[PDB]
Design a protein around this ligand. Structure first.
Ligand SMILES: CC(C)(C)c1cn2cccnc2n1
Ligand SMILES: CC(C)(C)c1cn2cccnc2n1
Lengths: 268, 269
């Protein structure tokens, strides 16, 4: 792992592990999601940001402010197989006072070809009250120095899947996985549920026959609210179509919305 | 990752990842368990065994036989922190017609000190009928060549914790975590539940206050039956004890069929 010559992006190589693959012997979409966040943490550590908080500036800690994921978008062309080396390059960019955006390019270490790409949208929030608030000028000066000033987008294309408004799934759902609880392995170092568990919980309502005959090409996920340690989640799916699905994660009780998203699958 | 000079053991170094640690910022016991199985797979791959199954010889595939975990024993002195490099050395040894044993030594890459150690007991079984059998002579000649012939035990000691008979938890249990289902992330490449998920499911019945004030020093787990994708598990715990001991039991939430039993030992922080 290391920063590029300009110190404006970071690269890391990962060997795919035995327990990180599914039935095809290729990395799962949660393994990829985990590698994206690990290379993101390493990029922030390599530019001065200390442990406890992810990329929280000196002003952010003083004011009890954290960066939170609002959206995650992932497109995979080829899933690296068990034993293969995947090289991921990541960088962060400012989007004015709306928030910040972090992008990734997944490549095959042997061929040099792009096998996948991802984009995430982060917003600033008070860790205690959970209130959003715009990006303050004083905090911008602190992190802008680590970001390229010119646009560098993993998803440049006019009208692409990463910015499309996601609708709310209507009842009754076509498919469903009810009673999902997180365990200690689903929690991060700060005792919150890691954003990767939501990806897995969304995919639990996808029927096994679709998973066996298709490969996940695209996934877009909107994070609305966090699931607490003692909360139970219900996963709902409906085919909207390649196969497309509209997804919805909600609390098993009150029916409070925690996540919404879409997936696109290709026939093998 | 590479075999030692004699080709009778294997070593690999691992950097501890951000998502692999708990509240203390040190690797969880499931992260360690995962690293032990990964270095075990890499050792078998480096000595000729194909990707298909784990260490299944040419005769084993012909007769639809596989190696299955019967017992797992793990002792941790220091949990490596996020960013630290942990070096693990592993090897396999025969235990006559009973089956095989695989051992591991966890070390700090910087200090060279032993920070942990583990031992597992494997038995031979038919893939389809699920019936156990002794290790055949023909099968033994095929894998004995990769094992040191002299004893090499991670847990040598006269009466150590790795061989102690585990009792069955009596009802009512003191603590419990009900309704545990595996998800796709809990399954391996062959669609079975990973043996590491059982470790996590056992620890779900341990109260949060014990986890917050103590560190897991020892864990012994006996694998009796596998949990299917559509099975629901119940985790039961009872304190049996400065150190805290617990008796554990995993069973199917329906019929109450026993799938796992074990013990843990925790020391105060
Ligand atoms: C490039 C640095 C490390 C300043 C940064 C800040 N970020 C906020 C949210 C997401 N990624 C981020 N990366
Ligand atoms: C050293 C080799 C690759 C022969 C081997 C066989 N095993 C059976 C059970 C557990 N580990 C094992 N390793």
């Amino acid at each position: 792992g290391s920063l590029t010559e300009d110190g404006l992006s970071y690269k890391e190589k990962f060997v795919v592990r035995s327990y990180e693959v599914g039935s095809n012997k290729t990395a799962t979409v949660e393994t990829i999601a985990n590698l994206l966040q690990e290379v993101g943490c390493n990029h922030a550590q390599s530019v001065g940001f200390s442990t406890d908080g992810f990329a929280t500036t000196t002003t952010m800690r003083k004011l009890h402010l954290i960066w939170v994921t609002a959206r995650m978008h992932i497109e995979i062309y080829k899933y690296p197989a068990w034993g293969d080396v995947v090289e991921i390059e990541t960088w962060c960019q400012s989007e004015g006072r709306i928030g910040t955006r972090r992008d990734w390019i997944l490549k095959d270490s042997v061929t040099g070809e792009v096998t996948g790409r991802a984009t995430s949208k982060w917003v600033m929030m008070n860790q205690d009250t959970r209130r959003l608030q715009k990006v303050s000028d004083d905090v911008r000066d602190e992190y802008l120095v680590f970001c390229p000033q010119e646009p560098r987008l993993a998803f440049p294309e006019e009208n692409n899947r990463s910015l499309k408004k996601i609708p709310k799934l209507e009842d009754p759902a076509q498919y469903s996985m009810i009673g999902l609880k997180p365990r200690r392995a689903d929690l991060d170092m700060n005792q919150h549920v890691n954003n990767v568990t939501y990806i897995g919980w969304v995919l639990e309502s996808i029927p096994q026959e679709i998973v066996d005959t298709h490969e996940l090409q695209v996934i877009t996920l909107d994070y609305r609210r966090e699931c607490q340690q003692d909360d139970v989640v219900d996963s709902l799916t409906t085919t909207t179509s390649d196969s497309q699905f509209l997804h919805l994660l909600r609390l098993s009780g009150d029916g409070q919305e925690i996540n919404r998203g879409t997936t696109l699958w290709r026939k093998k």
